[PDB]
């Protein structure tokens, strides 16, 4: 090449290792010394708190008046059910609120697969157990409210009829970790590669989780443009 | 939620408090919770290591063959002069290298103000003493090389050249010297959650506080180009 | 149900076991005897041939004229590159044709991660090697055409034209389903004893999710039957 | 997937009744490979999931056990139950209908002698159930016809005894199925087939409705994936 004063060498998503359906290892590579931790800490903060996502916020179970109520033909208590509903990982098309209906009579587990198939709704882990009906004459009929939000708004902060409130885990990102490691490139010798380890709820893809973290970051800096 | 700026309020340079000529307190305000430290740490890392800046790298003094003493008519030894030249804070237009000539005969201090006025070269502290000529028949004539760079770069360079440069001085190209930040709850009255990031800067004068920030942000934003939109 | 016309248990996606990023095991459960193989064979046929998906159809490499010509500074021959481009797994937003540009100068592998970042495009396996530049003065600049199609249409089945000169044709593997297998297994239900559970083993190219691959197979099936299920 | 109409959907294009209980239905616009896909799907539904009414119980006056024979009837009670098994009846919208058969005279007591019920349609009225020998002979029975699936034997059911008799239920409205894919010569394109489904029914079901019910069972199984 030809120049006089170098000041670039930007990283790019170079590899994706899906350890599982909800755990991956993304690696941004050309990283000038010190930039591993700079982007690593910036992103880890965005991923761990500013990611969008859908989450169950309310549930209306038939016969259940309040949380400390009773469901004779159900193994776990209503509280345990709301705790089960919190882990309902759902990916919805574009709406910011969708009502899910769950009708189930029988002996055995009432899983997320028993939820009424809505075309515009995606159930990440259908094998996710929400209930366990004990007797063969037992049944549950509930309307699970799923909303689009950010972060973690628990039941407390509110201003509210069997409307059962459930702690909202809106964030598609469950656990972020990063390592800087020497990306021993043939060319130079001082370059690193940032390895971002993700543990999502499935509702978000690793690469899109990164491209949204970067977008939140870059947009915060919009008022400090200065080209070059 | 749609395109270009969502729910997230964005920060902007809201105030600049120059504690002195080289120490200031910049404050970016509308900051959603958690963004104070996110930008604060991102920027503090860019400011503390990726800032450009000019620095004296070589000096050619007439009569002086090498860094070890003997200069007839000058108070301080050549080494002390090179150490003095290191502190020469210069802000240049757009040359990654400019040669400054300093001719001076006369009793008293040879300051940075005596350097030959180059149009594009801006001398931050003209009262910066480089020398002290003892007798009245004493004089120095040197060509000070000023280069653009980043970070510290020791006198270690080369191994074995029409144009030369006899004496070498350790280059501390960084303009930014020390960074500190505080998040503090902002004051807007309406939403009273919001924070304001206060970035405390101690520069070498060759760089303005706001431009130091807008360059830090630009290095950050450009690193993210493969995950955002630009490029 | 009340007057009764049904008298039959309907299966539903009950579990998804992602053996890996591109291999999963989907299981539809309440299945009346004989229905495991009936749906299993129906679906396996739809999945194995009627699935949509994105695929590289054309490529325009700078300096390369014919598909059987040389290249300065690249390890593998142009044919090998087109074969490499076939395995480019890309997931695009909403578009039946997107042009991807790949500019790369240097030494080492030119992977899918080097493709110019389009917002519209999603590159499934960025570590996918497309090239290997031998000398440092070596470089490739190509425009890879990615189209939305169905199943697999070989180069042969594109023998006419448009701009034959330069545009190198590549075999299109539109379907994101590389291999399907199914097992019926007794779903040893709590009370019943005639019920099975259909286990569909999938080996996709990543561009398609297991459950959506099934819900698209079922949709192709159900829609074929539209003239015998309603139409009135 | 963007989805929405790209494949050539087939439709019932012709019906060739080789006889009263044997037909050849043909669904035509069929993209390559879809002949066998639908052909095998349907053939499995037709061969095992079809409804159909069947005689399950019979209450003959004077008769108690199957070991009885009757005063005035040619064939023994067992033979009569075996005759009742072949009673092909098509009922409106019910899962159980009681048929009454009163008959005095000499000659065959056929399905045509069964008391005309509005809902009940008797497919083969000339179907012989009995043969009364003397002219003072007569039978009076209530034949129970139920809706169900597949072949459900009498052993799946069995003061002391109730009224009487049980008969092996052959609910399946269809006996045998066969299909051929054959290239269609549709005057549009050329890489298309036509599925020919050969049916041998018991008469209680029409060919086209047998297909439209097979397709409906199929499509409804896929409801959770559509």
Curated annotation (Swiss-Prot), chain C:
Changing residue 162 to K: 5-fold decrease in CRP-class II promoter-dependent transcription. It comes from the Bacteria. (Microbial infection) ADP-ribosylated on both alpha subunits by the phage T4 protein ModA. ADP-ribosylated on only one of the alpha subunits by the phage T4 protein Alt. Changing residue 188 to C: In rpoA101; temperature-sensitive. Keywords: Acetylation, ADP-ribosylation, DNA-directed RNA polymerase, Nucleotidyltransferase, Transcription, Transferase. Transmembrane segments: none annotated. The keyword Plastid does not apply. GO terms for cellular component: cytoplasm; cytosol; cytosolic DNA-directed RNA polymerase complex; membrane; transcription elongation factor complex. GO terms for biological process: bacterial-type flagellum assembly; bacterial-type flagellum-dependent cell motility; cell motility; cellular response to cell envelope stress; DNA-templated transcription initiation; intracellular iron ion homeostasis; nitrate assimilation; regulation of DNA-templated transcription elongation. Homodimer. The RNAP catalytic core consists of 2 alpha, 1 beta, 1 beta' and 1 omega subunit. When a sigma factor is associated with the core the holoenzyme is formed, which can initiate transcription. Both the N- and C-terminus interact with different regions of transcriptional regulator CRP. The rRNA transcription and antitermination complex (rrnTAC) consists of RNAP, NusA, NusB, NusE (rpsJ), NusG, SubB, ribosomal protein S4, DNA and precursor rRNA; S4 is more flexible than other subunits. DNA-dependent RNA polymerase (RNAP) catalyzes the transcription of DNA into RNA using the four ribonucleoside triphosphates as substrates. This subunit plays an important role in subunit assembly since its dimerization is the first step in the sequential assembly of subunits to form the holoenzyme. This is DNA-directed RNA polymerase subunit alpha. It comes from Escherichia coli (strain K12). The gene is rpoA. The chain holds residues 1 to 235 of 329 of the full protein.
UniProtKB/Swiss-Prot annotation, chain D:
The keyword Transferase applies. It catalyses: RNA(n) + a ribonucleoside 5'-triphosphate = RNA(n+1) + diphosphate. Disulfide bonds: none annotated. One of its GO terms (cellular component) is transcription elongation factor complex. It comes from the Bacteria. Keywords: Acetylation, ADP-ribosylation, DNA-directed RNA polymerase, Nucleotidyltransferase, Transcription, Transferase. Changing residue 159 to K: 5-fold decrease in CRP-class II promoter-dependent transcription. Residues 1-226 are annotated as: Alpha N-terminal domain (alpha-NTD). Its EC number is 2.7.7.6. One of its GO terms (biological process) is transcription antitermination. GO terms for molecular function: DNA binding; DNA-directed RNA polymerase activity; protein dimerization activity. (Microbial infection) ADP-ribosylated on both alpha subunits by the phage T4 protein ModA. ADP-ribosylated on only one of the alpha subunits by the phage T4 protein Alt. DNA-dependent RNA polymerase (RNAP) catalyzes the transcription of DNA into RNA using the four ribonucleoside triphosphates as substrates. This subunit plays an important role in subunit assembly since its dimerization is the first step in the sequential assembly of subunits to form the holoenzyme. Homodimer. The RNAP catalytic core consists of 2 alpha, 1 beta, 1 beta' and 1 omega subunit. When a sigma factor is associated with the core the holoenzyme is formed, which can initiate transcription. Both the N- and C-terminus interact with different regions of transcriptional regulator CRP. The rRNA transcription and antitermination complex (rrnTAC) consists of RNAP, NusA, NusB, NusE (rpsJ), NusG, SubB, ribosomal protein S4, DNA and precursor rRNA; S4 is more flexible than other subunits. The N-terminal domain is essential for RNAP assembly and basal transcription, whereas the C-terminal domain is involved in interaction with transcriptional regulators (such as CRP) and with upstream promoter elements. Belongs to the RNA polymerase alpha chain family. This is DNA-directed RNA polymerase subunit alpha. It comes from Escherichia coli (strain K12). The gene is rpoA. The chain holds residues 2 to 232 of 329 of the full protein.
């Amino acid at each position: 090449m030809q120049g006089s004063v170098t000041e670039f060498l930007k990283p790019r998503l170079v590899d994706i290792e899906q350890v599982s359906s909800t755990h991956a290892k993304v690696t941004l590579e050309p990283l000038e010394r010190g930039f591993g931790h700079t982007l690593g800490n910036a992103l880890r903060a965005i991923l761990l708190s500013s990611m969008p996502g859908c989450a169950v916020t309310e549930v209306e179970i038939d016969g259940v008046l309040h949380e400390y109520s009773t469901k004779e033909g159900v193994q776990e208590d209503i509280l345990e059910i709301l705790l089960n509903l919190k882990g309902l990982a759902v990916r919805v098309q574009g709406k910011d609120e969708v009502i899910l209906t769950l009708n189930k009579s029988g002996i055995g587990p009432v899983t997320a697969a028993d939820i009424t198939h809505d075309g515009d709704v995606e159930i990440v882990k259908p094998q996710h157990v929400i209930c366990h009906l004990t007797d063969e004459n037992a049944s549950i009929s509930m309307r699970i409210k799923v909303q689009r939000g950010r972060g973690y708004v628990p039941a407390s902060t509110r201003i509210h009829i069997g409307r059962l409130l459930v702690d909202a885990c809106y964030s598609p990102v469950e656990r972020i970790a990063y390592n800087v490691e020497a990306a021993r490139v043939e060319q130079r010798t001082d370059l690193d590669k940032l390895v971002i380890e993700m543990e999502t709820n499935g509702t978000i893809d690793p690469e899109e989780a990164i491209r949204r973290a970067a977008t939140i970051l870059a947009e915060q800096l919009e008022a400090f443009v200065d080209l070059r």
